[PDB]
Amino acid sequence: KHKILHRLLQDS
Amino acid sequence: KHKILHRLLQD
Amino acid sequence: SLALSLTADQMVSALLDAEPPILYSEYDPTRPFSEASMMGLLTNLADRELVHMINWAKRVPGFVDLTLHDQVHLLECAWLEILMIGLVWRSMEHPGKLLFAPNLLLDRNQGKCVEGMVEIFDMLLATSSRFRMMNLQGEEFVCLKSIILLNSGVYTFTLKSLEEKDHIHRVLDKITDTLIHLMAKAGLTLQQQHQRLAQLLLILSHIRHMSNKGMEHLYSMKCKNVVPLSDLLLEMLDAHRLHAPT
Amino acid sequence: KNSLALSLTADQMVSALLDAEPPILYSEYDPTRPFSEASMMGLLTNLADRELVHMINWAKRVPGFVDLTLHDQVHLLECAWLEILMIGLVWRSMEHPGKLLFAPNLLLDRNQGKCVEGMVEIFDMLLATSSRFRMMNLQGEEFVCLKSIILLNSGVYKDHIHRVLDKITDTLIHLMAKAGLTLQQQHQRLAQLLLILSHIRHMSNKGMEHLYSMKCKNVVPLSDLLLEMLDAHRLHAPT
Numbered sequence: 001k002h003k004i005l006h007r008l009l010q011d012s
Numbered sequence: 013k014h015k016i017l018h019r020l021l022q023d
Numbered sequence: 024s025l026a027l028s029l030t031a032d033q034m035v036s037a038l039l040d041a042e043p044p045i046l047y048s049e050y051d052p053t054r055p056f057s058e059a060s061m062m063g064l065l066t067n068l069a070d071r072e073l074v075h076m077i078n079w080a081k082r083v084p085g086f087v088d089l090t091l092h093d094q095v096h097l098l099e100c101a102w103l104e105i106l107m108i109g110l111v112w113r114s115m116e117h118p119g120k121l122l123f124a125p126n127l128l129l130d131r132n133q134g135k136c137v138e139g140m141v142e143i144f145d146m147l148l149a150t151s152s153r154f155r156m157m158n159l160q161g162e163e164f165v166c167l168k169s170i171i172l173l174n175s176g177v178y179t180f181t182l183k184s185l186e187e188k189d190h191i192h193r194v195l196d197k198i199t200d201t202l203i204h205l206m207a208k209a210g211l212t213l214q215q216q217h218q219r220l221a222q223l224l225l226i227l228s229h230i231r232h233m234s235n236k237g238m239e240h241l242y243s244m245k246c247k248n249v250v251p252l253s254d255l256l257l258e259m260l261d262a263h264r265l266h267a268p269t
Numbered sequence: 270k271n272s273l274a275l276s277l278t279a280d281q282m283v284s285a286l287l288d289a290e291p292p293i294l295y296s297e298y299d300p301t302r303p304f305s306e307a308s309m310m311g312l313l314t315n316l317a318d319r320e321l322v323h324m325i326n327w328a329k330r331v332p333g334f335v336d337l338t339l340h341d342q343v344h345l346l347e348c349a350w351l352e353i354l355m356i357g358l359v360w361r362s363m364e365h366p367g368k369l370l371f372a373p374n375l376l377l378d379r380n381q382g383k384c385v386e387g388m389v390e391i392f393d394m395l396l397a398t399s400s401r402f403r404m405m406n407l408q409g410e411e412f413v414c415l416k417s418i419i420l421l422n423s424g425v426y427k428d429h430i431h432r433v434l435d436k437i438t439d440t441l442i443h444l445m446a447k448a449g450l451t452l453q454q455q456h457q458r459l460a461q462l463l464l465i466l467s468h469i470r471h472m473s474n475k476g477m478e479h480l481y482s483m484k485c486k487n488v489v490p491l492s493d494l495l496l497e498m499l500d501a502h503r504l505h506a507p508t
């Protein structure tokens with residue numbers, strides 16, 4: 001499980 | 013409030 | 024690698040283009056102020072700013088060269104310092120006030136609405152006054168904000184993890200070269216350049232202090248339950264609450 | 270009236286700072302190799318209390334400091350004391366990788382930081398700062414300049430302090446130029462050193478927050494001086 005910040009940073 | 017620092021800083 | 028190949032002028036152009044927009048608050052002057060409503064406006068504003076900050080960080084040269092876990096760590100550590108430097112920058116031309124948004128200009132007296140907030144407002148106003156008297160330039164501001172992002176979490180991070188820190192230090196050296204280039208272009212003598220470089224970096228310690236003092240009030244139970252906080256902001260706050268005393 | 274500090278030359282500034290250095294104090298020999306919350310806090314508080322007396326007399330000898338009002342002198346020391354103790358600790362820990370030399374007879378590793386709740390994280394940050402100073406080959410003359418900058422820069426906002434801070438900058442640049450560094454190397458090293466100051470501020474804020482909590486205050490009896498230095502920061506803390 002990865003946090004909102006990790007998710008938004010990951011996004012492309 | 014009389015601080016210790018006030019005393020210690022005096023010569 | 025792309026960060027190291029940039030000339031100082033290219034570094035400035037890339038940082039200027041990466042700049043996030045100025046957002047509006049939901050401030051309504053027909054409504055009176057309270058602790059809850061003031062906390063509500065600032066949290067909602069900070070929350071929408073975080074999303075633009077995440078996308079700004081990705082455009083900071085050398086930032087995407089880091090691992091995802093390191094990008095998360097730097098943003099968790101620096102987010103409030105970054106919001107604060109942006110606030111003191113846009114507040115420069117408003118002596119005695121903080122321009123939170125084009126529609127939200129607040130005095131130190133309005134800071135007394137929230138318990139423990141006026142002390143922070145005084146520090147933010149002092150910093151804004153210091154930037155004004157130094158005639159801080161937009162080009163310098165973008166360099167400082169980038170230094171905050173890259174520097175604030177660099178020491179709180181195997182040999183693989185050590186290469187990440189070395190790369191951060193190289194990019195920070197590039198931002199210093201950029202700051203000096205800007206000052207030299209501005210006609211400052213070498214003594215003036217070094218003195219200005221130093222004055223700007225010392226201001227960064229004040230911004231760290233303000234963020235730590237502010238963060239401590241934000242993750243206290245009173246401020247966490249004053250208004251319903253958003254999920255991303257809660258996680259960003261918890262990254263700090265986690266190390267705080269029980 | 271005009272301050273003597275500004276009339277000082279770079280060499281006279283360095284020599285005034287090196288001469289003002291407080292000594293390295295010893296821990297009490299009584300408890301050896303601390304492994305409890307009480308023994309660890311007992312040794313560190315006793316040591317910090319003794320170093321504070323030396324710090325006050327050191328600050329009086331920092332050019333420009335005596336020219337401030339007594340009220341401003343109190344404010345700067347209240348703001349900077351833990352940052353000053355921490356930069357001192359990190360400096361003397363340099364030649365001891367992975368260890369914190371609190372005193373020549375008190376060398377502690379990170380496992381000892383675990384004995385006090387909330388301490389190991391600060392210990393880790395201190396070790397990484399000592400390690401950074403080691404890799405940069407921080408010199409004694411640079412250290413005394415950084416320590417004086419911490420004292421004068423502690424208070425978030427002024428003319429006199431900013432003129433003294435500029436003189437210290439000139440002194441740091443004078444030392445690096447004397448060491449053979451080029452102009453690019455001088456500005457790069459000046460920036461590296463001052464950015465470490467943001468980290469020393471962060472460690473102080475994080476440590477202070479634990480030190481002024483009730484649980485930290487109750488572990489061992491604290492001297493009246495230490496309690497007054499803590500309460501200067503506790504006053505701004507949330508309720």
Ligand SMILES: O=S(=O)(OC1C=CCC=C1)[C@@H]1C[C@@H]2O[C@H]1C(c1ccc(O)cc1)=C2c1ccc(O)cc1
Binds near residue numbers: 065139140236
């Ligand atoms: O450090 S603070 O003053 O936070 C508090 C809050 C309560 C009591 C004491 C300090 C902070 C700086 C400024 O006012 C606060 C605050 C804030 C940030 C995040 C939140 O979740 C809520 C509020 C501020 C701020 C908000 C947006 C900006 O672009 C810049 C600063």
Ligand SMILES: O=S(=O)(OC1C=CCC=C1)[C@@H]1C[C@@H]2O[C@H]1C(c1ccc(O)cc1)=C2c1ccc(O)cc1
Binds near residue numbers: 317
């Ligand atoms: O920030 S700290 O790690 O403090 C704590 C204490 C308990 C829990 C978390 C942090 C602090 C730095 C170093 O270890 C602590 C501590 C200390 C200082 C004053 C006190 O009244 C008590 C302890 C430290 C220290 C003591 C003397 C020095 O010369 C340098 C550092």
